[PDB]
Enzyme design. Sequence first.
Site, PDB file in Angstrom:
ATOM      1  N   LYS A 101       4.838   3.076 -11.961  1.00 20.27           N
ATOM      2  CA  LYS A 101       3.686   3.799 -11.362  1.00 20.27           C
ATOM      3  C   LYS A 101       2.379   3.101 -11.735  1.00 20.27           C
ATOM      4  O   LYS A 101       2.239   2.694 -12.855  1.00 20.27           O
ATOM      5  CB  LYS A 101       3.594   5.202 -11.899  1.00 20.27           C
ATOM      6  CG  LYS A 101       2.392   6.013 -11.428  1.00 20.27           C
ATOM      7  CD  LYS A 101       2.318   6.185  -9.946  1.00 20.27           C
ATOM      8  CE  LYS A 101       0.956   6.740  -9.545  1.00 20.27           C
ATOM      9  NZ  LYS A 101       0.701   6.962  -8.101  1.00 20.27           N
ATOM     10  N   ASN A 133      -0.053  10.995   1.491  1.00 20.02           N
ATOM     11  CA  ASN A 133      -0.195  11.325   0.107  1.00 20.02           C
ATOM     12  C   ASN A 133      -1.638  11.136  -0.330  1.00 20.02           C
ATOM     13  O   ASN A 133      -2.347  10.219   0.092  1.00 20.02           O
ATOM     14  CB  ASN A 133       0.729  10.504  -0.852  1.00 20.02           C
ATOM     15  CG  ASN A 133       0.145   9.190  -1.271  1.00 20.02           C
ATOM     16  OD1 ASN A 133      -0.620   9.105  -2.226  1.00 20.02           O
ATOM     17  ND2 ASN A 133       0.421   8.168  -0.511  1.00 20.02           N
ATOM     18  N   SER A 134      -2.038  12.024  -1.238  1.00 12.25           N
ATOM     19  CA  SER A 134      -3.235  11.817  -2.013  1.00 12.25           C
ATOM     20  C   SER A 134      -2.871  12.194  -3.405  1.00 12.25           C
ATOM     21  O   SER A 134      -3.350  13.203  -3.962  1.00 12.25           O
ATOM     22  CB  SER A 134      -4.409  12.681  -1.497  1.00 12.25           C
ATOM     23  OG  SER A 134      -5.616  12.388  -2.281  1.00 12.25           O
ATOM     24  N   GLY A 151      -3.563  10.918  -6.296  1.00 12.26           N
ATOM     25  CA  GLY A 151      -4.597  10.818  -7.353  1.00 12.26           C
ATOM     26  C   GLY A 151      -4.281  10.130  -8.669  1.00 12.26           C
ATOM     27  O   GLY A 151      -4.799  10.491  -9.741  1.00 12.26           O
ATOM     28  N   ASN A 156      -3.156  -3.455  -8.852  1.00 16.17           N
ATOM     29  CA  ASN A 156      -3.483  -2.653  -7.666  1.00 16.17           C
ATOM     30  C   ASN A 156      -4.957  -2.649  -7.319  1.00 16.17           C
ATOM     31  O   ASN A 156      -5.738  -1.958  -7.960  1.00 16.17           O
ATOM     32  CB  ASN A 156      -2.989  -1.194  -7.861  1.00 16.17           C
ATOM     33  CG  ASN A 156      -3.138  -0.288  -6.671  1.00 16.17           C
ATOM     34  OD1 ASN A 156      -3.732  -0.593  -5.678  1.00 16.17           O
ATOM     35  ND2 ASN A 156      -2.592   0.916  -6.816  1.00 16.17           N
ATOM     36  N   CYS A 200      -8.360   0.409  -5.950  1.00 18.58           N
ATOM     37  CA  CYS A 200      -8.933   1.116  -7.099  1.00 18.58           C
ATOM     38  C   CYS A 200     -10.426   1.492  -6.873  1.00 18.58           C
ATOM     39  O   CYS A 200     -11.066   1.010  -5.925  1.00 18.58           O
ATOM     40  CB  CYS A 200      -8.702   0.286  -8.380  1.00 18.58           C
ATOM     41  SG  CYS A 200      -8.955  -1.524  -8.264  1.00 18.58           S
ATOM     42  N   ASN A 243      -0.346  -1.742   0.761  1.00 14.79           N
ATOM     43  CA  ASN A 243      -0.500  -0.323   0.350  1.00 14.79           C
ATOM     44  C   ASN A 243      -0.561   0.600   1.546  1.00 14.79           C
ATOM     45  O   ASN A 243      -0.560   0.145   2.747  1.00 14.79           O
ATOM     46  CB  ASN A 243      -1.762  -0.160  -0.571  1.00 14.79           C
ATOM     47  CG  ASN A 243      -1.572   0.908  -1.663  1.00 14.79           C
ATOM     48  OD1 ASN A 243      -1.235   2.032  -1.374  1.00 14.79           O
ATOM     49  ND2 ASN A 243      -1.939   0.577  -2.903  1.00 14.79           N
TER      50      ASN A 243
HETATM   51  C1  LIG Z   1       3.879   9.238  -3.410  1.00 13.23           C
HETATM   52  C2  LIG Z   1       3.302   7.843  -3.389  1.00 13.23           C
HETATM   53  C3  LIG Z   1       2.740   7.253  -4.545  1.00 13.23           C
HETATM   54  C4  LIG Z   1       2.224   5.986  -4.517  1.00 13.23           C
HETATM   55  N1  LIG Z   1       1.572   5.465  -5.585  1.00 13.23           N
HETATM   56  C5  LIG Z   1       1.218   4.137  -5.533  1.00 13.23           C
HETATM   57  C6  LIG Z   1       0.718   3.504  -6.731  1.00 13.23           C
HETATM   58  O1  LIG Z   1       0.701   4.267  -7.766  1.00 13.23           O
HETATM   59  N2  LIG Z   1       0.371   2.236  -6.612  1.00 13.23           N
HETATM   60  C7  LIG Z   1       0.504   1.501  -5.486  1.00 13.23           C
HETATM   61  O2  LIG Z   1       0.236   0.296  -5.465  1.00 13.23           O
HETATM   62  N3  LIG Z   1       0.923   2.036  -4.329  1.00 13.23           N
HETATM   63  C8  LIG Z   1       1.304   3.323  -4.333  1.00 13.23           C
HETATM   64  N4  LIG Z   1       1.875   3.909  -3.193  1.00 13.23           N
HETATM   65  C9  LIG Z   1       1.966   3.098  -2.013  1.00 13.23           C
HETATM   66  C10 LIG Z   1       3.305   2.426  -1.864  1.00 13.23           C
HETATM   67  O3  LIG Z   1       3.608   1.601  -3.015  1.00 13.23           O
HETATM   68  C11 LIG Z   1       3.409   1.725  -0.543  1.00 13.23           C
HETATM   69  O4  LIG Z   1       2.395   0.669  -0.557  1.00 13.23           O
HETATM   70  C12 LIG Z   1       3.203   2.605   0.738  1.00 13.23           C
HETATM   71  O5  LIG Z   1       3.815   3.938   0.680  1.00 13.23           O
HETATM   72  C13 LIG Z   1       3.796   1.971   1.987  1.00 13.23           C
HETATM   73  O6  LIG Z   1       5.201   1.739   1.853  1.00 13.23           O
HETATM   74  P1  LIG Z   1       6.195   2.733   2.710  1.00 13.23           P
HETATM   75  O7  LIG Z   1       5.863   2.522   4.139  1.00 13.23           O
HETATM   76  O8  LIG Z   1       7.479   2.219   2.317  1.00 13.23           O
HETATM   77  O9  LIG Z   1       5.820   4.091   2.151  1.00 13.23           O
HETATM   78  C14 LIG Z   1       2.360   5.178  -3.274  1.00 13.23           C
HETATM   79  C15 LIG Z   1       2.978   5.733  -2.173  1.00 13.23           C
HETATM   80  C16 LIG Z   1       3.423   7.047  -2.170  1.00 13.23           C
HETATM   81  C17 LIG Z   1       4.018   7.568  -0.902  1.00 13.23           C
HETATM   82  C1  LIG Z   2      -8.462  10.845  -6.824  1.00 19.17           C
HETATM   83  O1  LIG Z   2      -8.094  10.849  -5.427  1.00 19.17           O
HETATM   84  C2  LIG Z   2      -7.562   9.647  -4.954  1.00 19.17           C
HETATM   85  C3  LIG Z   2      -7.672   9.395  -3.581  1.00 19.17           C
HETATM   86  C4  LIG Z   2      -7.159   8.232  -2.995  1.00 19.17           C
HETATM   87  C5  LIG Z   2      -6.513   7.296  -3.814  1.00 19.17           C
HETATM   88  C6  LIG Z   2      -5.988   6.132  -3.259  1.00 19.17           C
HETATM   89  C7  LIG Z   2      -5.344   5.189  -4.100  1.00 19.17           C
HETATM   90  C8  LIG Z   2      -5.191   5.375  -5.481  1.00 19.17           C
HETATM   91  C9  LIG Z   2      -4.496   4.416  -6.232  1.00 19.17           C
HETATM   92  C10 LIG Z   2      -3.037   4.928  -6.519  1.00 19.17           C
HETATM   93  C11 LIG Z   2      -2.362   5.063  -5.213  1.00 19.17           C
HETATM   94  C12 LIG Z   2      -1.973   6.332  -4.766  1.00 19.17           C
HETATM   95  C13 LIG Z   2      -2.142   7.570  -5.453  1.00 19.17           C
HETATM   96  O2  LIG Z   2      -1.763   7.684  -6.639  1.00 19.17           O
HETATM   97  O3  LIG Z   2      -2.735   8.496  -4.828  1.00 19.17           O
HETATM   98  N1  LIG Z   2      -1.334   6.497  -3.479  1.00 19.17           N
HETATM   99  C14 LIG Z   2      -1.077   5.396  -2.665  1.00 19.17           C
HETATM  100  O4  LIG Z   2      -0.657   5.594  -1.514  1.00 19.17           O
HETATM  101  N2  LIG Z   2      -1.501   4.160  -3.087  1.00 19.17           N
HETATM  102  C15 LIG Z   2      -2.084   3.966  -4.368  1.00 19.17           C
HETATM  103  O5  LIG Z   2      -2.362   2.803  -4.575  1.00 19.17           O
HETATM  104  C16 LIG Z   2      -5.747   6.554  -6.017  1.00 19.17           C
HETATM  105  C17 LIG Z   2      -6.385   7.514  -5.202  1.00 19.17           C
HETATM  106  C18 LIG Z   2      -6.935   8.674  -5.750  1.00 19.17           C
END
Ligand SMILES: Cc1cc2nc3c(=O)[nH]c(=O)nc-3n(C[C@H](O)[C@H](O)[C@H](O)COP(=O)(O)O)c2cc1C
Ligand SMILES: COc1ccc2ccc(CCc3c(C(=O)O)[nH]c(=O)[nH]c3=O)cc2c1
Lengths: 313, 313
Positions: free
Chosen positions: B44, B68-69, B71, B128, B131, B195
């Site tokens: 994560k 997703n959001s 956070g 990542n 940010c 992403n």
């Molecule tokens: C629940 C959730 C949590 C995620 N958290 C991160 C994260 O912590 N860091 C990150 O680089 N991308 C995060 N992502 C984005 C994924 O790594 C990915 O880039 C994105 O969902 C697209 O791939 P998919 O089409 O297979 O979902 C998250 C995605 C989801 C759905």
């Molecule tokens: C505090 O509210 C927000 C809103 C949008 C965010 C987008 C990416 C990120 C980075 C972690 C991340 C998240 C996540 O943890 O929300 N989800 C993704 O789809 N990609 C990511 O890279 C944090 C966010 C936090």
Amino acid sequence: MCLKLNLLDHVFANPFMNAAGVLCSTEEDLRCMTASSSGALVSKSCTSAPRDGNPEPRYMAFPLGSINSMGLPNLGFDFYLKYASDLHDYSKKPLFLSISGLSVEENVAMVRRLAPVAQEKGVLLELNLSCPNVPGKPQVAYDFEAMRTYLQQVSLAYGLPFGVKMPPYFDIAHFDTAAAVLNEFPLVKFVTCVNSVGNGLVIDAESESVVIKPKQGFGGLGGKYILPTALANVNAFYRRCPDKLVFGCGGVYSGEDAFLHILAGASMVQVGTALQEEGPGIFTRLEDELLEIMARKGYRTLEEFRGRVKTIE
Amino acid sequence: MCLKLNLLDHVFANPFMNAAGVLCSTEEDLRCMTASSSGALVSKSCTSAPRDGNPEPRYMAFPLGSINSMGLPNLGFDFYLKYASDLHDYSKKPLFLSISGLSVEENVAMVRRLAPVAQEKGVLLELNLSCPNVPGKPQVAYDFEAMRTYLQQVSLAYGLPFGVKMPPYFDIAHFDTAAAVLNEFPLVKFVTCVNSVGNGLVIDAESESVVIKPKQGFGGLGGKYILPTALANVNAFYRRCPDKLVFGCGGVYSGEDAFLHILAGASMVQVGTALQEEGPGIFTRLEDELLEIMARKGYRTLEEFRGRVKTIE
Ligand SMILES: Cc1cc2nc3c(=O)[nH]c(=O)nc-3n(C[C@H](O)[C@H](O)[C@H](O)COP(=O)(O)O)c2cc1C
Ligand SMILES: COc1ccc2ccc(CCc3c(C(=O)O)[nH]c(=O)[nH]c3=O)cc2c1
Ligand SMILES: Cc1cc2nc3c(=O)[nH]c(=O)nc-3n(C[C@H](O)[C@H](O)[C@H](O)COP(=O)(O)O)c2cc1C
Ligand SMILES: COc1ccc2ccc(CCc3c(C(=O)O)[nH]c(=O)[nH]c3=O)cc2c1
């Protein structure tokens, strides 16, 4: 129970219309949109000179949407102005004319000449802010300084209410900045969200090949792929532009899709890829479907739910 | 016949891994991904201090994808480092650690501590670049001057090969600018594209509500909605970054989908939404399906077709 709307000093039987570029390039196309149950129609984004556009194949569609790099093929401005001025039956429905000059001066020259026709016939301008910029710079609406320049000049040159076709944005800071720019221009009365999701790439697994010829297969996406992106931009701009109308465009295939757009804040709802695929018969179905959703929910008019999307706690 | 490959001085059983943030937040998650038939796993994205994330509901999935959001809920960097340094079984598969500090300084502090663990254990860094940034400013990857600073500072602090997680771009000028930034940094050995497609909006027609609580329902899209976006970004960077690897992420639900990312140029293929929905058994299905397509085509290696997507004349 009814789908009528009255806006921009026009009356619309229903909120549906084609999206620019679909079923609207020739006189045949425009007559066909006019004959449809649509509440309005928009002409193909034009340039001052006619254009053949990009090499084919340049449009393809699939179960979840479409990709295109058409390259602004169009009959030239004089043809669309003439359609507006002499051929279009405004007793049938209102007409939007879409312009997409390749420079700010090209756009200024067309809007100067559109003005008297707009005033006398009531043709409505939709200025396409994905027009390409200088190559190697971003499209106009992703260059906030160029966008400002375009709107100042077009506002001065046209002098009448108009609207703008916007690409999608993906970052809140962009929503903020873009709406702030639009809010500088009181003649911008409507904002169309969204154009295609830019520069996607569809690959066919069997042939191992991209599916469109221009730009090594990169092109704008439309259809089911983009509905949540479209909904987000409609609502972003709805919330940030309280003195303007928002028209929605992206991923409409059903009355339910149209309902969501309208809950997000859409006034008019445009239909691109689904119309391309299904043909103009799609308009009676969308109407019937949206009216069925309204009946089940007890809504009698569009205003009762437009912009009333609920948030959680 | 097997899908084994070697990249970044490590050996991988196959090209599949989870996408960051899916099935990888807790010790239980990491051990589950470790036990899976994936070729690698990523943790994560983490911050210096533990975070609870945003209010629930904050993730929802549907037939075409997810929003997703979250956070950045995470157990904090000390936990992931300790996992990397003492708990992970490197005999099973390689581990990538994702860091997502809220400033440049936070990222530098985490990478300085990670470096000796990378040297000793071979844990790989995925930085990542979705940010936080300075006042009313886009995410870092959409502000090329901030991106450059982040990479300068991280390369100096970390001193070892690493990769970067990129948001999608939609404009060819942006691809040109972003890749040029990246190619300034020789330690950036892989680029993960992409992403989530930022700030979409899913609305439920029956309840007339958005489906996630944070940010008035706005959040990142994954899944089927984003595959052509993801393929475009993989290919664009594959084309522009010939001395780097590109990892594909976005819309992978089948071995066919994985095939298309590899044709686009992907070395590793990450699975987010489909993994969240199907669970870790998905990895055996994807392997089987990919090997099945290879067999039908007569391909024995990934190298025979990686980046070999055909264009039309
Ligand atoms: C629940 C959730 C949590 C995620 N958290 C991160 C994260 O912590 N860091 C990150 O680089 N991308 C995060 N992502 C984005 C994924 O790594 C990915 O880039 C994105 O969902 C697209 O791939 P998919 O089409 O297979 O979902 C998250 C995605 C989801 C759905
Ligand atoms: C505090 O509210 C927000 C809103 C949008 C965010 C987008 C990416 C990120 C980075 C972690 C991340 C998240 C996540 O943890 O929300 N989800 C993704 O789809 N990609 C990511 O890279 C944090 C966010 C936090
Ligand atoms: C074949 C084709 C041509 C298009 N030409 C134009 C155009 O000339 N001007 C414009 O503003 N948008 C144009 N668009 C964008 C559409 O108007 C619309 O914004 C986009 O396709 C999304 O709506 P959809 O998801 O219903 O397709 C075109 C789209 C398609 C598929
Ligand atoms: C100068 O050569 C080109 C090449 C590609 C273009 C793509 C979009 C546009 C804007 C018109 C347009 C088109 C289009 O005509 O390709 N397609 C869309 O999906 N939306 C649009 O707004 C103009 C281009 C011009």
